[PDB]
Design a protein around this ligand. Structure first.
Ligand SMILES: NC(=O)C1=CN([C@@H]2O[C@H](COP(=O)(O)OP(=O)(O)OC[C@H]3O[C@@H](n4cnc5c(N)ncnc54)[C@H](OP(=O)(O)O)[C@@H]3O)[C@@H](O)[C@H]2O)C=CC1
Ligand SMILES: CCC(CC)n1ccc2c3c(N)nc(N)nc3ccc21
Length: 192
């Protein structure tokens, strides 16, 4: 696949944009994990699937029994990997672009984490869209976080919900979702 548009999908706690703590997510938001699954799996074209790209640490964090993530082509990046097709669902690569050369019959490509991947790939021009779940809490300072996004948001524009709706198609987008003390909303950003 030559020069696909790539989207970053992430959930972050405002205002610092914290995303993890000691290798894990700092929260358990049930509806948010379901949205992630629906967005990353759904396709419009016929015999296609989406691709999800992740760093090695993120892959290793999913229990072995639950990987690869079903119904999507999984791509795992490591600086130590040769570009190799493991099976029909798993690819090893050392660069985003080399990995895409190995794929076909993919509709959309999503970068799914983690921190290092996000922070480096945000500056790659292949990245055209950001799907950020913006989480709010009454006392964000009480949530222990060690990992944060370093995104240059002054160069991106947050779109109206109508554009997000168009991006996700059929997916139901509820507003101000509350789970425990967290309140969240889904958003779409594009480059200025
Ligand atoms: N809030 C959210 O939506 C999400 C949060 N996370 C959180 O992220 C954290 C994990 O992030 P982190 O520890 O940074 O790990 P990553 O998942 O980003 O993996 C880092 C590894 O990826 C490889 N890698 C990184 N950058 C590159 C590159 N540019 N080219 C090739 N290989 C690369 C390296 O593998 P090697 O060392 O083998 O070279 C590196 O060690 C956890 O807290 C996790 O819960 C994860 C996903 C979503
Ligand atoms: C499904 C496996 C887990 C492991 C951390 N996971 C990995 C990536 C994501 C993930 C992501 N990238 N974006 C958003 N919005 N939500 C997520 C929820 C869970 C995630």
């Amino acid at each position: 696949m030559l020069k696909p548009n790539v989207a970053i999908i992430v959930a972050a706690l405002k205002p610092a944009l914290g995303i993890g703590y000691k290798g894990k997510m700092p929260w358990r938001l049930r509806k948010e994990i379901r949205y992630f699954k629906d967005v990353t799996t759904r396709t419009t074209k016929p015999n296609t699937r989406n691709a999800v790209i992740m760093g090695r640490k993120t892959w290793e964090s999913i229990p072995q029994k639950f990987r690869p993530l079903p119904d999507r082509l999984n791509i795992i990046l490591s600086r130590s990997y040769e570009n190799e097709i493991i099976d029909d669902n798993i690819i090893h690569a050392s660069s985003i672009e080399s990995s895409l050369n190995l794929v076909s019959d993919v509709e959309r490509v999503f970068i799914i984490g983690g921190a290092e991947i996000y922070n480096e790939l945000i500056n790659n021009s292949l990245v055209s869209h950001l799907l950020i779940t913006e989480i709010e809490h009454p006392s964000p300072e009480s949530i222990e976080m060690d990992t944060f996004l370093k995104f240059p948001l002054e160069s991106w524009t947050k779109q109206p919900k109508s554009e997000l709706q168009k991006f996700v198609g059929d997916t139901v987008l509820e507003d101000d979702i509350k789970e425990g003390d967290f309140t969240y909303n889904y958003t779409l950003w594009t480059r200025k």
